[PDB]
């Protein structure tokens, strides 16, 4: 979905190195070992729930979908938090309301001036604005 090329490549490399020759069918213990080798450390109940969500053989598309559920979102949130501290001179996380209004008006697609002003008045930290936009 919203993954990166390097992440999918590493996942496929790990799946090909752990699984034997033949089809992509793996067992429950094999899936747990692949998850532990990939970097994730899920509990027993969480692993059982993820297995039930997808013979008991986990194929490549289901595994890629399970890996793309939250990793891409976390990476995007980290990238947004890193890029939000660019307009600030010192990057302390707090900026004036006029600067944020100008940034929202002159950037971020085409937005109406009245709507941008109303959104700025309804809303100091960038994380607070991100959480308000996510809500």
Residue numbers in the entry: 3 to 56, 61 to 129, 137 to 148
List passages from the publication reporting this PDB structure.
Ryanodine receptors (RyR) are >2-MDa membrane proteins that allow for the release of Ca2+ from the ER and SR, thus mediating a range of Ca2+-dependent processes. Each forms homotetrameric assemblies of ~5000 residue long subunits. Mutations in RyR1, the skeletal muscle isoform, can cause malignant hyperthermia (MH), central core disease (CCD), and other myopathies. Here, a collection of cryoEM structures provides insights into the molecular consequences of MHrelated RyR mutation R615C, and how apoCaM opens RyR1.
In order to understand how apoCaM engages with WT and mutant pRyR1, we solved cryo-EM structures of CaM compIexes at nominally Ca2+-free conditions, obtained by adding excess EGTA. For WT pRyR1, this resulted in two main classes that could both be refined and with structures built. The main class, corresponding to 70% of the particles, represents closed channels, whereas 27% of the particles contributed to an open channel class. Starting with the structure of the closed complex, the N-lobe is the best resolved, and mostly makes contacts with α helices in the N-terminal part of the Bsol region, encoded by residues 2190–2242 (=interface 1). In addition, the N-lobe is close to a short loop (~2595–2600) connecting two helices further downstream in the Bsol region (=interface 2). The C-lobe region is poorly resolved, but can be seen to make interactions with a helical region encoded by residues 3627–3634 (interface 3), previously found to interact with CaM in vitro and dubbed CaMBD2 (=CaM binding domain 2). Additional interactions include two helices in the Jsol region (=interface 4), including a peptide (residues 1975–1999) previously identified as CaMBD1. Comparing structures of WT pRyR1 with and without apoCaM, both in the closed state, it is clear that apoCaM introduces conformational changes: using interface 1 as a reference point, the Jsol region including interface 4 is moving closer to interact with the C-lobe. Despite these changes, which propagate into the whole cytosolic shell, there is no discernable effect on the channel pore. Correspondingly, in the cryo-EM condition, the WT pRyR1 + apoCaM dataset shows mostly closed channels, whereas the mutant shows mostly open channels.
